[PDB]
Structure formats: structure tokens, C-alpha cells
Design a protein around this ligand. Structure first.
Ligand SMILES: [Ca+2]
Ligand SMILES: [Ca+2]
Ligand SMILES: [Ca+2]
Lengths: 452, 451, 451
């Protein structure tokens, strides 16, 4: 009776780069099949506008700020990671009988205690850092050359992939390999006779922009070189989703599986993505940076052919997956999301009269976002707080703060209140970022929460 | 095992009760408890303002040791006095006591920081730093703001609660809290365990709002604010009388230890008087953290006496624990002492031991050390001063120049004591925390410099 | 079957100040006996180039940076110490049946929970601070005079020694007393019928430079006054080692005991030491500061008359002692060392293709060191990173970074990677050091890891 759960996460997939969310040029039929026979979300938000903190939030069900994970891990490697006392959704499900697998991108710590096998994943196949070169014919020779030279700090994008701690020699284009291993996983799950949970973390369409010629050949009308490469990268994900769906059907798993497909953040416009109609992209507190595509699919439980128009947070997946699995959640875990299912079924706002936050730090100041009901408050580029009616003004073109003073001020002060239990960052993505953090007396919330 | 009542007035000045020298405000019911018990001429709180003082009372620890050196953010927060420091209420509750808290909290409004999770079976009051006194005034303002859609409403006008459910209060807040203190000790009769009551009045803290009937009792007080203040204190005294008539009615009075005190010194610009002490609220001068206190407990606490040796608010935790038969573990790191053995023998419970105060400011800190007859003072970025506080209670005569070695030794022991102070877990305003970080605080290089 | 273990640690013993490690002037025959019938180490490194952090590392098996112990404890006293959640090697061995003793210098916290008896030492005899005056005839009168004056913050070098928390009145030159108590310990261990572990932490030859006339009389050819005093101090250690060895033989303990003799850091050149052929000394990331003498001795298990030429870290003693004792180590402990025994027996590098680090903080910047295989990277005096082939260039005279850019950069980046789990310091050795730490936004790893 308890359903299987598949969380598919594309990396830097732009808002307009799947068909079901308005793509005019990239075609994603297998992903679209899941949308057409399920529900898509027009107001889905991640907890942070870039990779590491967004992913920390997905797994922990907590705003990354609450657990010191506001920054990506140090790009050249580290002995730190998402804190081990915050129980991952995989570990919870595993403790309630689920068979658990994770594939592809991790970027939440490479130490023994931060490794997927210790965060409640029985199976893991992928690469532990922030991304990876896509062609083994290219990356394996570079790693061979650097290792034989004696070097220990080798760029994590060319290191060998692993399976449960043992290295492997990958042969296929990485997107295809991860898809293949997703098939292998759900095939292994047939014999287990428990429900299963799969975290499928594709690196596509994250840099570097490397695509197969066979995928790029499907977009002859895309004249721009990078956009074409990107299109091929996304299509490879779509082929993967089709390959996984044929395997689920083969095993009679398809009907009792909740599939969630989403992005971890907004697309990067300078690396082939499109976020139409949203402003800006990756790393912004504008909508482009943390409003993402999402679909649910689960026959007879998730309504087919619908589009859910109320705010949903990536933080909601933790308690929602838990509720659907029959897993008790303790109050000592401090989950920032909500079980969105009661409100989803009744077609009501699961965050009625409640804020959804984004807060991205920069050098000496912070950009911020608040989404509640129809309203979107925006703090960006050291400007005064702006307010938009995001239902009417999705592109954030018309600041109506001047005629809503009390409402905006109230929203900012509630964020100010919310800020106090944010931990100091446990790391930064670069050594100079942490020096500057300390030099600038951060967080400079005097700037961030100043009002009229 | 005795019942225990800790009554705490908020910003009650040193000279604003009769038993501690008031010439103008009259407090007969409070004075009754003094007359038939023991008052304390050298009683000190752990910090010269509300939040950290109260954190210390409940935890038995200097607030600096647990990151609670500042009042909680004035516009609300998700933080509070850390949950791993067990409150005296929780300890007593685990040793069979029925536990109640009334009025002011100001130690965290989250589920895990709420009174019901800090070991209080009953709670009636308001969770923030204070409250407007008249429901006729505050409830319409809250109705208007709530219907407007606003979520960050000023905590002084929000509705009071009883164990997490809201209520619609009808009386002047001081009288309501007194009434609920009666209701509590009445509920305690049927329980047949001993009880503990934390009665945290907001009077005479701002705003200065008094009943006309109380102000009418001070026709000779010409100053408007002092009159209002006087009426506010008198309302507390009426409350204490109403509680005492209830204790007698239930035959609880004879087996109850009542402690009446202030959380800190009075604020001179808001109607208080701290005579004969210098300065007031927030100072490391005596005015800021030397407070009135009485114990009352028939046959156990001597009647009509005045105890002249130093006592700390930190002492109430282990002293209440000892009197209740509650074991205290060393892993708790209590900074106070069980003052009862020394109290009975009329000896100094802190003989040859310092009592500290340390209040932070913008880019520097003021400090105080009280040991035996001596009072060391660091204030206003001046050199350390020393006073013989037995002879010189008003701190008029700095005798540091002729006691160099002693002063230096005292400061160095404070310097030693400072190292396990945690970084603050919050500040009362966002700018205070920014400045803390900008100024590289604590600037203990200034605070512990000697010559 | 399970061996006894003795860790003898001299304090600030210079690289060239024992015979077995090249001394031409100081003579140390009993120490040399252990070298001659065992193995010495030419490439032995401690975890930090000064006392407190080095010792924290020895006991915890962790780089002191990982546990907030990068600085010596506050010189005038404190309520902090090496964190209690990092299990000491003594506690581990004690939990696996060993009888445990510690002698002399502690300098890892003087509070109840940081005291030797709570860090897994059944027996303790010594002084809790960073050093001590050597002659009871001199120091006890000064302490008597200051205590009777009323002072509480008395210089830790003159305070009385203790035995398991009770004070004593020591009569002998401190080095001789500690040696005597080491005898007393191994005599007490005979009756126990378990294996034993002894941490013998001499303060010699740390300042102050105080020696017996009888020891100084053995070096008539040393014309320099301080070097002679120093020589006598080291000789007193050597007499102690002989006195301990005669006791081990008397009890038939000698043959089944692993004796490790080492220094906690490099010698201080301005206080009588010699670090030949190494550059600089105490507190430097040059070799002089953290490359130290070490010998192992254990008959039939440790090869006799050999000299091990591969890198060994003080961090290795924790897991190596554990493995030899049959004590399981959990991964949750985060040991930074390795069990060096498999590689030691095969005469292979126990840290093949693995770095050994040093990182000493200063005012506004940090000096650093990396030792891997033949290479030594050096960050000193705010200069660019240097690289030496330490096999060819032990004195660090010839920077070959200009022709090995990729290798140096790779080494620094691996240190940069390693730095991220370093905790903020939990204390500093002086109040102004911590203020400056905060003012200068430390750690300034932007300077420390620039390439
Ligand atoms: Ca991403
Ligand atoms: Ca107060
Ligand atoms: Ca030393």
C-alpha cells in the first residue's frame, strides 16, 4: 500500500526549458507525458537560488540558513558537509522500511560521515562534488595524466565516479549512465518487496555545456551554439526519464510510484538556459533564481492534466514524503516546510497567510525574497525593498510598495524575526568569501531589514 | 517539603518599598512579610536589566555563560534561553512540585522555549518584555491591527494566554495576575503535592499606567510620573495582600517560602527611586543590580531581622533545590550557592568569593565586582575604581589609589572568570549585533586593563 | 600479553640536546641506552610548535585546530580546557583495563571536568599550569607570603603541587620528584595485575632555567652560563630516566613496556637550547619549531640499534598505542594520525603520499608548514610559499619553488582543503590576542593559502 517515491532533480534547468512549463524550442516528450497525466506547479519555489543550499534543504526539510549551509561547499574540496544531526529524508524513509538509492550529484560533503551511504542511501552511484565532465573519453585521460604526475587536489569534475565507495570506469555519456543506473536500481527494487525511494540528481544541464551529437541533431532550428548544446543536454535527461518510465511499467511499479521532477534552482542565462517569463536567473532573489518547474505524477492519487497555481516549497517534500510513507516526524527536527498534501487535494494554498523565503548572501550585504499569497517582496542590489503582485506581475516590472507601506514593512519585520535562529555559516565556497564575511561583520541585517 | 513563591517586580527601585526605606510609597502587605521575616540589605541580581536577570534566576547561571547577555529582539524572534540549561521550575516539577508561572516571560516565545516546556504546569501571562495595563485600551488596537492583516504586532498589546490558548482579559493587568496567583494556590490545595509559583509582575515597568483608585492614595506626590509609579507599586502591594489572604485561607501560608524581589534597579527617568544607591537600571553602579529582597517562612526564616551579607539571585536555584530535596548534578554548572547554611548561622554565604555584573555597551563593557566589604567598578571607560561598600554605599570615595594589589587581583579573577562566557546568541536590536561584530566584541582588553 | 606504555615528554628539549640525536656537549647516557637498544626517529614531528596545542594533540590524537585548542590556555588562569568530548588516550586505555598515571605538567585545563582524574588518569602528581619553579626552598615561601596577603590570582609557577586533588608539600628539585613519583607509580602497578600507562610530563628544560649544582658540575667545559644551566636540567631528566629504568627492571616490567621518549616542541634558542642542524626553534613552522627527538624502546618488538628515517607524527601515538593495547577506536573520534606500526615494522613511510601539517597563528596572519615525502612547504614571515627538498636541505637554505610551481600549489590547496574543519579558537593565551584575532578577521587564510 505505501507508495514508492522518485525525486528527479535537474541541475540549473531553466523555467522555460521543458515543454510542460512553456518551452517553445526544446522538446521533452517523456517529461511532458508525466505532466499531461499528472499535475504541474506554476508557483514552485526552492529554498535557495543555487545548488548546495537548495539540495541541503531538499534532503533536510530545513532552510539551509538554519543549519549553517548557506553557501556551496569549498570548490577545491573540504572535510565539512551538511550537519549529520539533521536527519535526511532518505534516512527517515530507510528507517521506515524503504529501499533507498541516490544517483549522480551529491555536493553535501565527501567525508565518511557525510557520504550518501551514511545519510540513509543503501545504494549510491555518482560523483560527490558540484558537477562533472560528461564524456569519459575526455575526462578519464586528464585524470590519468594528473594522478601519475603525483597531484592530490585534482579538479572534482574529472575524478572517477563511484558505486558505494568503490571507484568505477564509466563508459557512457554521464546523463545516460545515471539513467541506466536508475533502471538498474528500480530493477533491484523488485526483489526487495519493500517500497523504494530514489534520489535521481542529474548534473544536466549544469556546465560544462557538453552534449551528444545525436541529441543536438534533434534541434536543427536552434541557431545559437550554446542553446543548441543545452537543448541536447536537456533532451538526454528526457530520454533518461523515458528509459526509467519503461522500466517502472515493466516491473508494475509505475502505478504505485510518486514521481517528482524539478530543478534545484533557476537556469543560468549565460550558459544556455531560458527562464521566461521570469526576471534574471541562477542565484537571484528575483523569481528567475528560485522559482522552478515541478510536476507530481502518481495515478489515481495525483489528478491528471491539472496545473496547481498555489505556492509550494521544496521544503514541503520532506514532511509530505514522510506523511505519504507513514513515517512519524519529531518536533525536535524543526522542519520549515509543511505537509502540502491536505491542501493539494482540496486545491487550497498550502502556505495560506505564510511566507516563503529566499536569502542569498553577497559581499557585505544580502539579497532577499518573500512570497506570501499574491505578494512578492524583493530586496536586491542594495535597493529599497520592493513589492509586486506576483499573480499579476510575474516578470516583476511594477513596484507597488509606495501604495502598500504597512504590508511591506510587516513582511520584512517577519523575515527579520525569522532571521535570528539562522546559524553562522559553517563554511564558504571560497576562502576569500569567509574572510570578507568576517571583515564585513556579516550578516549585515541592518541593511537587509531596513524599512520606510 | 515547603511550597515556594518567587514574586518578582519589574524595575522596582531600591527605595520604592517601605521595608527598604520608602518615605512616600506605602506597601503595607509587602512590609508585613518583611516585619515577620528577613529582608536583605545586600541582595544582587546577575545583570542590571530584565532578560538576562530573569534567565539567571531560572537557570541559576550567569547569563553570560549561556549566551543570554542581551534582552531578546524587541520585535520578536525564534530564539530563547537555551533548552539544555534546566530551569528551576523543571527541576522542582521532576521532584513532585505543582508548578505555575504568571505574567512576564521574556525568555523565548517558540514551542520549546514556552513556559509549559520549561517545567511550568500552569502559565497565565504575556510572553514578551512587557504589556499595556488596560484591556479597554490595548484590545481595540490589537483588533484593528489583526483585521488589517498584520502579523508583526507590538507584543505589548497582544492578547494574554493561559497554557497556549488566548484569553480576553478584563481587569488592570497587575490585578489580573494577582487574581490568577490566587486561582493557582487554590488549584494547589486539591493537588496534595508542594507547589512552586513564579509571579512575574510587569509593574512598575513602562508604560506608566495606573488606576485612579491607586493614584488617589498618594495626594501628596506632586510629580505626575512618580504618582503614576506609586499607584503601580501599590497595585502590586494589593496583589501581594490578596495572595497572602488566599494562602492563609488554605493553611498554605505557614509552610510556604515567599521571596519578594526586583529583577533589577529602577529607572529614574520612569518614576523610580534608588536611594541611597547611585544611578539605576542597566548600570554596574549599585543602583542597577542591587535590589530589595525579603524571605518569609514562619519558624524557619527569622522574623523581624535584616540580613547584611551579600546574596545573589543565582543562589535561589540551589537554595530552592536543597529545601525541596532535589539533587543538583555538577554537569549543570550552577554559578550560585546554597545560601541556607550560611543564612541560618548569620555568616557571609559568599565569604571570600566574588559576585559579578557585566553589562555590554557600544564598543566596550561596564563591570562590577562585589567581594566581602569591597566593590570594584568599571564604568564609562574610566579606570577601575574601588569602594568600601560597607562604609560608602553611594560609591562617593574611590580608594583604589591605596589598594592597588587588591583591585588588580579582583580584576584578574574576573578576567579569569570571563573565558567561558559564550558569544551572545542574540541581541535586542539588529544594529546592536552588527556593532558587536564591527567592534570585535567583547573588548575585554579595555574591560580588564590594570595599573 | 598486552604491553605497558610509557610516554616521556620533555618540555622544549632542543633537537641537538640529547646524545642519540647528535649532542656534542650535553650527555644523556640513560636516554641513550634506550636509543642504543631501540629505534630513534630522524623525522618525528609534533602537531604544533608550542606546548599546549602539542600536548592537546598527543592526548586527543587530533590536530589542535580541529578542537579549538590552537593557543596555550590563558596564562593567568581560566575555566576552559581541551574539550571533554574528545576522548583522551588515557581514558581509552583505562576503559580497556589499563592502570593510568600522569606526572608533572598538564596545561590542558584546571576545572573539575578538565582535571587529569576526569581525563582517565587513575593517578596524578604534578602542577596543572604551563610550568613551575624547580626549587621548593624558593617557591613555597613566595606562595605562603602571597596567600596570607589574601591574593587569589597567584602565579601558577609557584603554587603547590598536588596528588589526585589534595595539595602536597614537595621537598625535592621538581625534576627529581617527578622521577621519584614515576618510580612510585610503576611500583604501585606491580600489585594491580593489569597493564599500565604512564604519561611522564617533565617541565625540564622549560624556563625558568634552574638547575642543581651537582648536575651543572658535570659540564665544566660548558662556558656559557645559560647553556650550562640547561645542560644540568637535561641531565636531571636523564638521571630520572635511569631511576625509572632501574625500577622497571626490578619489577620485571622493562621487557614488556613500550617506552616513548620525546619533546613536545623545538627548543628555545634564547633559553639554552640547540636545534642543530635545524633552522630557528620554538613556535616556528621552520623545522626547528616542530621536528623533535623521539625514540621507541620495547625489547624483541622494536628493533634495537636502528634509526627510522620516514616521517612520523605525534598524532600517530594515539591509534598506535590503541592498536597495541587491543583498544577499538571509533570513526566518530576523527583521529588525524595513523597506526604507524605496520609501516614501522616493514620500514616503509607510514605517511607515504600524505601531508603532515603545522599551523601557528600570529597577529593578523599565520605561519604554516607541510611535510610530504621528500618535500617541505613553508609559509613564514608573510613571505611567498617556499619549497625545500628536506632530504637534501634539512637546514632549509635552498628554496626550489621557482622550479616546482604545480607541486607547491597542489600542496597548499590540500592544506586549504584541510583547513575548513578547523574550529574557531575556544580561547587565547592573552586577552589582547583574542581581541586582535577578532579585529583582524582571523583566520586570514586568504594570505595563508595564496598562490
Ligand atoms: Ca544548480
Ligand atoms: Ca526589569
Ligand atoms: Ca614546550
Amino acid at each position: 500500500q505505501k507508495p514508492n517515491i522518485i525525486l528527479i532533480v535537474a541541475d540549473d534547468l531553466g523555467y522555460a526549458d521543458v515543454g510542460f512549463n512553456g518551452s517553445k524550442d526544446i522538446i521533452t516528450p517523456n517529461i511532458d507525458d508525466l505532466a499531461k497525466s499528472g499535475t504541474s506547479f506554476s508557483d514552485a519555489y526552492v529554498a535557495h537560488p543555487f545548488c548546495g543550499p537548495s539540495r541541503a534543504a531538499l534532503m533536510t526539510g530545513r532552510y539551509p540558513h538554519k543549519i549553517g549551509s548557506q553557501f556551496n561547499l569549498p570548490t577545491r574540496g573540504s572535510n565539512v558537509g551538511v550537519p549529520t544531526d539533521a536527519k535526511f529524508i532518505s534516512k527517515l524513509l530507510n528507517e521506515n522500511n524503504y529501499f533507498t538509492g541516490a544517483l549522480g550529484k551529491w555536493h553535501m560533503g565527501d567525508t565518511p560521515q557525510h557520504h550518501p551511504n551514511k545519510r540513509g542511501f543503501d545504494e549510491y552511484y555518482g560523483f560527490l562534488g558540484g558537477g562533472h565532465n560528461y564524456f569519459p573519453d575526455q575526462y578519464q585521460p586528464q585524470y590519468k595524466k594528473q594522478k601519475a604526475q603525483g597531484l592530490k587536489n585534482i579538479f572534482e569534475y574529472i575524478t572517477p565516479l563511484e558505486h558505494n565507495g568503490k571507484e568505477v570506469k564509466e563508459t557512457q555519456y554521464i546523463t545516460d549512465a545515471l539513467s541506466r543506473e536508475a533502471v538498474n536500481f528500480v530493477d533491484k527494487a523488485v526483489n526487495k518487496k519493500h517500497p523504494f525511494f530514489l534520489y535521481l540528481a542529474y548534473n544536466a544541464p549544469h556546465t560544462p555545456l557538453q552534449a551528444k551529437d545525436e541529441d543536438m541533431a534533434m534541434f536543427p532550428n536552434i541557431k545559437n551554439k550554446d542553446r543548441k548544446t543545452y537543448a541536447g543536454m536537456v533532451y538526454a535527461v528526457d530520454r533518461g526519464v523515458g528509459k526509467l518510465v519503461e522500466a517502472l511499467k515493466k516491473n508494475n511499479q509505475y502505478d504505485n510510484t510518486l514521481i517528482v521532477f524539478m530543478s534545484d534552482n533557476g537556469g543560468k542565462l549565460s550558459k544556455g538556459a531560458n527562464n521566461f517569463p521570469l526576471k534574471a536567473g541562477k542565484g537571484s532573489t528575483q523569481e528567475g533564481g528560485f522559482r522552478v518547474p515541478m510536476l507530481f505524477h502518481w495515478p489515481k492519487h495525483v489528478p491528471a492534466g491539472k496545473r496547481f497555481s498555489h505556492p509550494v516549497s521544496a521544503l514541503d517534500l520532506y514532511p509530505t514524503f514522510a506523511a505519504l510513507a507513514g513515517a512519524k516526524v519529531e518536533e525536535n527536527q524543526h522542519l520549515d516546510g509543511t505537509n502540502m498534501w491536505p491542501a493539494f487535494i482540496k486545491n487550497e494554498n498550502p502556505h495560506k497567510d505564510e511566507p516563503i523565503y529566499a536569502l542569498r548572501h553577497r559581499k557585505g550585504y544580502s539579497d532577499a525574497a518573500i512570497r506570501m499569497n499574491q505578494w512578492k517582496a524583493l530586496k536586491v542590489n542594495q535597493q529599497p525593498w520592493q513589492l509586486f503582485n506576483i499573480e499579476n506581475d510575474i516578470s516583476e516590472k511594477h513596484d507597488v510598495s509606495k501604495s502598500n507601506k504597512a504590508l511591506l514593512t510587516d513582511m520584512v519585520r517577519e523575515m527579520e524575526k525569522w532571521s535570528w535562529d539562522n546559524q553562522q555559516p559553517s563554511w564558504f565556497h571560497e576562502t576569500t568569501e569567509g574572510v570578507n564575511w568576517r571583515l564585513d561583520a556579516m550578516p549585515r541585517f541592518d541593511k537587509t531589514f531596513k524599512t520606510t
